[PDB]
Structure formats: structure tokens, C-alpha cells
Amino acid sequence: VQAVQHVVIGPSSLIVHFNEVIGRGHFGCVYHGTLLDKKIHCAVKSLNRITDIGEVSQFLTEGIIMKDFSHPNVLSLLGICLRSEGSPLVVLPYMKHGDLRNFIRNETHNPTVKDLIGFGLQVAKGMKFLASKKFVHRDLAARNCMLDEKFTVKVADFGLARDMYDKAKLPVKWMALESLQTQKFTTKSDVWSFGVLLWELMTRGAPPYPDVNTFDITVYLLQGRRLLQPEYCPDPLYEVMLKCWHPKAEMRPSFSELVSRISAIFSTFIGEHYVHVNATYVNVK
Ligand SMILES: CNC(=O)/C=C/c1cnc2ccc(O[C@H](C)c3c(Cl)ccc(F)c3Cl)cc2c1
Numbered sequence: 001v002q003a004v005q006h007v008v009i010g011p012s013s014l015i016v017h018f019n020e021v022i023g024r025g026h027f028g029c030v031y032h033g034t035l036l037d038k039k040i041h042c043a044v045k046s047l048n049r050i051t052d053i054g055e056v057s058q059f060l061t062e063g064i065i066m067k068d069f070s071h072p073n074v075l076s077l078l079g080i081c082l083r084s085e086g087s088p089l090v091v092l093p094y095m096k097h098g099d100l101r102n103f104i105r106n107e108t109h110n111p112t113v114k115d116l117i118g119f120g121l122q123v124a125k126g127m128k129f130l131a132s133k134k135f136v137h138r139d140l141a142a143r144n145c146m147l148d149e150k151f152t153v154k155v156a157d158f159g160l161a162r163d164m165y166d167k168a169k170l171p172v173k174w175m176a177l178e179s180l181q182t183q184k185f186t187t188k189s190d191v192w193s194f195g196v197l198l199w200e201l202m203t204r205g206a207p208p209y210p211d212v213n214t215f216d217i218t219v220y221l222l223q224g225r226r227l228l229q230p231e232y233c234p235d236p237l238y239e240v241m242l243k244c245w246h247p248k249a250e251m252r253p254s255f256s257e258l259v260s261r262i263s264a265i266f267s268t269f270i271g272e273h274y275v276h277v278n279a280t281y282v283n284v285k
């Protein structure tokens, strides 16, 4: 009732545009939306699940939490909409440039080594923020990072917005060695995923490990193998990737140390080096 109020949006304030789908998910669809009080453009996820007395309240809990995760590099919640008609709708700010994987794959764009590391740096700061609240993402990947009108990168795909959106149910190519072996996740397993994220950035969104079977990944990693240095990835940034993929989670750098190190590397690049898609990775599912 009273305390919950800063989250809740009235059904009367929300116009969901059901004709205009943004994204398909296991747990519902995403559509453009219009929020009022003024016309604010938003994205609106419909959740199929809802009917429980508990889980309508429980989706109120993560709503409160998500509202407390405001940081420029983290995707925030506008509100939740509790409709007596059918389902509850998660209302998210609208991200002009959509997801980071598709932004860098788009062959109409010309990012430089500087822009790409800048994006990597922005994710590192969101994750630093998340990690400091003791929150483990479990599914960090370029596709799950958003990019707004000012080129702010927002770490996304957590809380009530959590799904698998890509065209099996575990994203094995981004998962740390120990998560694959024990199914358990920590900040240090997000650091591994983050390393794979920097690789996607430096390859402008190539699928990691194209030659490698999804069920063979553990054996691949235990044989001595890692993602190659991308053509345009600086040495010191590749060194950072390798550190993120240390086999022992304690030895991996913290997100604090990632922001500090990547900053150093960022401060040296000035938009002289244009990044272009590599021949081997181009057009691969
Ligand atoms: C060229 N720009 C676009 O296509 C933009 C689309 C857009 C713009 N803003 C968005 C804001 C939130 C959003 O959330 C959904 C549930 C989502 C999706 Cl569909 C995919 C990955 C994610 F990390 C998230 Cl959070 C999806 C959004 C999608």
C-alpha cells in the first residue's frame, strides 16, 4: 500500500502499443509504451505468469530493489503496472540505440577502438555498482546491455526484465569454468562473462567460439583454450580479457580493478583507429 507507492504506475497512465513488438522472451513480449504525467516513451514487458497473491507482491519486491539500482550504467525501472485485467506490466526507460550487440554489428556505424573500450568501460562501472550491492548478474553479454540516446551503456536483463531474448537455456559461452562445473555464480563469475563481453566489443559482436560446440565448452576451456586476440584489440586489453578468464575465481580482477585498468587503456586512444568487421566472424549464428 503506502510504502510500495513510489514504484506503482496506474493503468490509466500507461498506453501499451500492442501492435509494435520490440522483443520476444520466454516469459512475455516487449512493446513500445507511452507513459504519462506529458508523453514519455518507454518499453513495456508483459508477464504471462501473474495470478498469485504472493507473486504479485513478490514482483513488487524486485520492483522496490530495481528502483534502488539507479546508476548511469545500470538500466533502471520506471515502474510496474498492476492491472486487474490479466497481467502486470514492467515499464522500462526506452533505449534509443537498443542493445549493444546489434549496435556494434550494424555495418552503417564506424566505431573506433576508443568508442568500443569506452563501452567496455561503461559496463565495468555498472557492474562495479552492482557488485558493490552484492548483486550477481549471472547473464552478462553485449546483447543484454543497452545504449541510450547519449551513448550511455546500461547493464540490463536483471530483476523483472530477466529473460532469454536471443534467437541451450544456459548461455554457456559466457559462463565461467566453475559455473559450468557446479552451476554456482558469484561476482567473479560475472568477471569471466565481462571478459567475453570485451571480446564481443573488440570483434564488433562476433559470436564467441564459432567453431566450438555448446556442449563441448568445458572440455575446450580445460584443454588450455581461450578466445583469440581480436585484430583491433590492444595488447593490454587482451591481457585484461585473459585475467578475467583465470581458471581460479580468486585470481580474477575485481570490477574495481577493471574500471581502473580499462580507464588507463581508454585514456590513450583518441578516435584515430576505425574498427571494421573481421572476415572469419562475419555472418555467423
Ligand atoms: C534501434 N533501437 C531499438 O531497436 C531499440 C529497442 C529497445 C529500446 N529500449 C528498450 C528498453 C528496454 C528493453 O527491455 C527488454 C525487456 C530487453 C530486451 Cl528485449 C533485450 C535485452 C535486454 F537487456 C532487455 Cl532489458 C528493450 C528495449 C528495446
Ligand SMILES: [Cl-]
Pocket: 112, 113, 114, 115, 269, 270, 271, 272, 273, 274
Ligand atoms: Cl582510437
